[PDB]
């Protein structure tokens with residue numbers, strides 16, 4: 185997954201900035217009806233032209249000159265940036281050390297490289313439907329997390345285009361909470377804690393957290409299908425050798441015994457469960473628990489979190505419907521209403537949306553559908569405004 | 571037992587007797603030193619640690635039964651006592667430490683005896699979210715509360731008036747996965763209520779404390795308050 | 803042009819007795835006795851300098867209300883032209899715009915601003931210090947000290963060796979040194 189020729193990108197942005205951007209809807213979605221003064225003007229942008237010359241201190245008063253300059257330059261990477269304490273483009277006027285970042289929309293990102301600890305379907309630049317099963321399942325848990333135990337309803341979801349998916353939520357006041365709260369929620373959702381260094385990455389303690397209960401109820405509906413259908417992870421020495429090396433040892437030979445007398449990958453896990461029923465997670469009491477087996481399942485499909493992007497007030501990320509030149513693909517709105525019907529391969533690139541319009545507004549092609557999610561969130565905002 | 575238990579605030583600009591001034595000074599300092607000693611002797615929950623203190627403290631005129639608005643005697647004594655000793659320890663970290671730490675533990679103790687209804691209602695009078703659940707929710711959410719946290723054993727959780735919260739100040743009860751969640755309105759036993767009360771108290775208290783220490787020179791032009799200027 | 807080495811110790815001047823006039827004093831290498839002897843230096847060409855800090859509006863100075871117009875360096879230059887000559891009859895001047903800095907006790911003005919740097923010889927008299935115009939906010943550099951002006955312009959590090967490039971001789975010696983150079 186990438187782009188194949190930067191030759192078209194100049195003219196593509198040339199037309200896009202001209203007549204392919206919800207400058208009305210965007211000015212709205214940012215300024216938020218202008219309910220606050222010096223609200224938009226300090227809401228920052230960062231722009232990146234040829235050779236990736238990324239530059240801070242970018243902002244314009246209202247939609248008109250915003251457009252005019254966007255079309256004057258056509259930046260090739262655009263980050264929305266927190267409303268810092270004062271005038272961004274005139275930052276160096278006040279006494280130094282007095283310009284900082286007050287209030288930021290709360291951001292989240294999850295990578296596909298996250299799953300690379302076991303991901304064997306495709307590469308770091310190439311994908312397939314198998315890994316995308318994760319981009320279909322993981323978001324469900326994270327979404328419903330904020331949908332049922334965080335008292336928010338201003339959620340918005342996008343897939344970057346190459347690896348990550350984004351969530352730029354602008355909740356009533358969370359836009360204006362302390363970095364401490366950021367780190368807090370991060371710590372909260374950071375359940376399976378594993379990169380490429382530690383093996384027993386989940387020392388899940390005894391008593392569960394009902395959050396984890398709903399997590400499980402989601403796991404036993406969407407993991408095993410992908411696992412033993414799209415991968416059949418018990419296929420050769422390679423995969424399960426990246427598996428059995430996190431396990432206690434009293435039975436650690438029976439699993440391989442089931443490994444290499446096989447014509448499928450089902451009775452293996454079946455006898456796994458069986459011996460677990462005769463295994464003792466607790467030598468003390470009669471609570472034979474799914475600690476290790478479900479740690480296995482979850483860790484093999486769990487949203488790996490970032491420890492610095494979901495707390496900092498300096499990392500800025502892309503704009504709604506701003507092109508990712510290095511995939512063609514542009515920001516695709518993602519919804520629970522669409523999680524059951526998404527495919528990454530069919531959704532269009534900048535090249536493809538261009539060839540779409542290369543045939544008045546977004547009101548003709550599938551871009552009006554794609555921004556139905558946008559204007560839907562905006563509708564909710566109208567309902568958010570009293 | 572008295573209204574006394576309250577979060578210190580709003581210096582009471584009366585005008586008073588010089589005698590009563592130094593009296594309150596000495597009294598309160600005695601109480602402090604004592605509490606420290608009594609504490610370091612035993613462990614907290616021991617009933618000596620209760621009996622002895624609830625004897626001494628009641629002896630020095632600070633905790634009796636119901637009376638009028640604020641000009642009841644012992645609450646007034648507590649009030650002016652603190653808001654004097656404030657002028658005592660504004661000249662070290664070690665000092666300000668010791669003072670904070672001691673007042674902290676005192677308030678802990680002196681507060682741990684109020685009747686439950688008085689507890690919750692005075693919390694209500696304190697700030698906004700300081701509000702209680704309905705015990706029906708105990709039945710409704712026993713699974714959630716018990717299985718969620720390891721801070722409770724079995725099914726025998728007493729009839730504690732559990733509390734509704736904003737997560738925005740739960741900043742450790744939840745990130746450590748120690749509580750059930752209802753849209754950040756987590757429900758936690760009284761223990762952590764005391765904890766959080768005491769922590770916000772420490773914070774706000776230090777935040778005030780530093781100010782006077784940044785505003786000393788006034789006393790420098792008097793010498794009646796020469797002992798407590800820096801001589802306790 | 804000719805030149806000759808010497809040293810300098812004293813730096814004396816006075817505004818009133820004569821403005822735009824400085825005096826330097828020190829030692830001068832002399833070959834006749836193979837030593838250094840007395841001499842001085844008179845100095846003309848002293849420049850009062852101003853930094854015009856602006857507003858960004860045509861605000862009525864008699865009621866204090868904005869009106870909705872930006873400011874150009876041309877604009878403040880115009881108000882200079884037609885305010886100095888309005889009450890001080892500028893004979894000729896020179897100026898450039900510069901973006902400069904300030905970090906001291908003056909309210910609400912920042913360390914990064916527009917300024918119209920206006921030079922002119924000390925010949926012209928001075929003004930009220932906190933002066934302002936209808937379009938601009940203030941001007942720094944009114945009560946300046948010609949001495950420190952020369953110093954912090956030419957950046958001299960205190961006592962040090964010097965020589966005299968382009969030395970032109972004076973009208974009538976009024977110092978008491980065997981030699982003199984203007």
Ligand SMILES: [Zn+2]
Pocket residue numbers: 304305306311312313314315
């Ligand atoms: Zn693949």
